[PDB]
Chains A and B, each alone.
With several copies, the nearest count.
Chain A
Amino acid sequence: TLVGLVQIKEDIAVEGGKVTDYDLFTGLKEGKEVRKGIDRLDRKFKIVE
C-alpha cells in the first residue's frame, strides 16, 4: 500500500432507492490525495457489493 493510486471510499448511502449527484471524493483529505474540481475519477470504476 505504499505506492499505487488513491482508493475512493467504499460505502454509498442509496436510501430511498436512489441518490442524485453523490460525490465520490468524500472522506479523502483535500490537497494531498485529491484536488476538488481538478482531477477525474479513473475508468477502472466498478461496484463490487
Chain B
Amino acid sequence: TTNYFKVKLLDEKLIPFLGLGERGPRENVILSSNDLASLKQAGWTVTDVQPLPETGKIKYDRRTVYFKSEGETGKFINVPFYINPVDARDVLGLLKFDLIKLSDKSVVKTYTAKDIKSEILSLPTSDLEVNEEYELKLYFPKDASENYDIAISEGHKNLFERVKDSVFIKVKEYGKFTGRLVQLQQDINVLKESALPLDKILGYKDFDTKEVTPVAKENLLQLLSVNVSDESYARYQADKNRLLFFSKTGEILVKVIERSIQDNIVNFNIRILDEETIQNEIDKKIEYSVYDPKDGKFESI
C-alpha cells in the first residue's frame, strides 16, 4: 500500500488541494492518501484509483567491489531489485535504470524497469572499466512529472522527485598473484643519493611453472607493504615502486610483506655508500656490485 494515487476526478466545480484555477473534470491527478480520503469523504466522484510506485529500492549492498580480470566473456553481475505496489502501468514505462560512470558522469547503458523480467538485473561487465567507480540508479527522468497534476506544496517533494536508490560498483583489477616473493639480487649496494625500483630487486616464484619473473605489473604492488628499518635513511615511495636513499649511509633492513599468502616476509640488507667509499676499496680488490640507476643493471666496475 502507498500514499500516492493517480486518479481521475470527474466533478467540475473546483478542484481543491491544487493551484489557482484548475476547476474542471481532471484526469492524471496524482493525490496523497490524506488528499484522496478528503475527497471521497467530500462527495466527489473520484474514480480510476490506481496506486503508484513508492518503492524503487534495490535489494543489494551499495558500495561493492568487483574484481575484474582481463579475459571477461559474459560474467554478468546479477542485481536484485523490486518495485512493489505496481505490476504494469503507464508510470512503469518511466522508471529507468542507468549505469552512471562516476568518473565523468555519463551513462553506459540504460534499462526500463518494467522490461527487466524476473526482477533480476544482469549487468554485463564486458563494458565496465577498471579503477573507475560506477552508479546504478532508479531515477525518474525530469520530464516525467510534466504530464500529471501533482497536488503538492512548494517545498514538498513530489513522487517523481522522491523514489530513487543508488548503489556503487567499484571495478578494479583482480591481482592476488601466486608466489613466495623470492629475491632477485643479493648484496644490494646503492649509491648515496639515488633511487632503486622494486622490479629489479625482488620477484615472485610462480607455482604453476617455477618462473622468477619480477613484479612488472603494478596492480600487485598495493598488496606489498614495504617497510624500511630507519625512516631517515631511506623511504619507500607509494605512488612509485622506488626507495629514496637520502644523505645518511649505512645498513638498512627493507622488510617486504605480502598480506595474502602466509610467510612472505622478505628481508633485504641494503648498504648505502658514498662516492669515495668505492674508490678506496677498488684498489684492495673487494669485488662486489653496486646498483647503477642510469641503466638499471647491477655493475661492479
What count of chain A residues pass the 8 Å CB interface test? Answer: 3
Q: Determine if A20 is an interface residue (Cβ-Cβ < 8 Å).
A: no
Contact flags (1/0) for B239-281 with A, using CB distance below 8 Å? 0000000000000000000000000000000000000000000
**Interface of A: prevailing SS:** loop
Tell me, yes or no, whether A2 is within 8 Å of chain B by CB.
Answer: yes
Q: Min CB distance, A25 to chain B, in Å?
A: 16
> How many Cβ-Cβ contacts under 8 Å join chain A to chain B?
8
Contact with A along B1-44 (1 / 0, CB 8 A): 00000000000001010111000000000000000000000000
A1–B18 Cα distance when bound, in Å, is: 7
Q: How many positions in chain B have a CB within 8 Å of any CB in the partner chain?
A: 5
Whether, in the assembled complex, A26 has its beta carbon less than 8 Å from a beta carbon of chain B, the answer is no
Whether B20 contacts A7 by the Cβ 8 Å rule is yes
**Within the assembled complex, what's the spacing in Å between the Cα atoms of A38 and B20?**
24
Nearest CB in chain A: distance from B80 CB, A: 44
CB-defined contacts of A2 to chain B, threshold 8 Å: 14, 16
Tell me which residues from 1 to 49 in chain A have a Cβ below 8 Å from any Cβ of chain B. 1-2, 7
Q: Which residues of B contact A1 (CB under 8 A)?
A: 14, 16, 18-20
- Nearest-neighbour CB distance to chain B for A28, whole angstroms, equals 12
Identify the closest chain A residue to B17 (Cβ).
A1
B18, closest chain A residue (CB): A1
**Chain B nearest CB, measured from A4 CB (Å):** 10
| Chain A residues within 8 Å of B, Cβ to Cβ | 1-2, 7
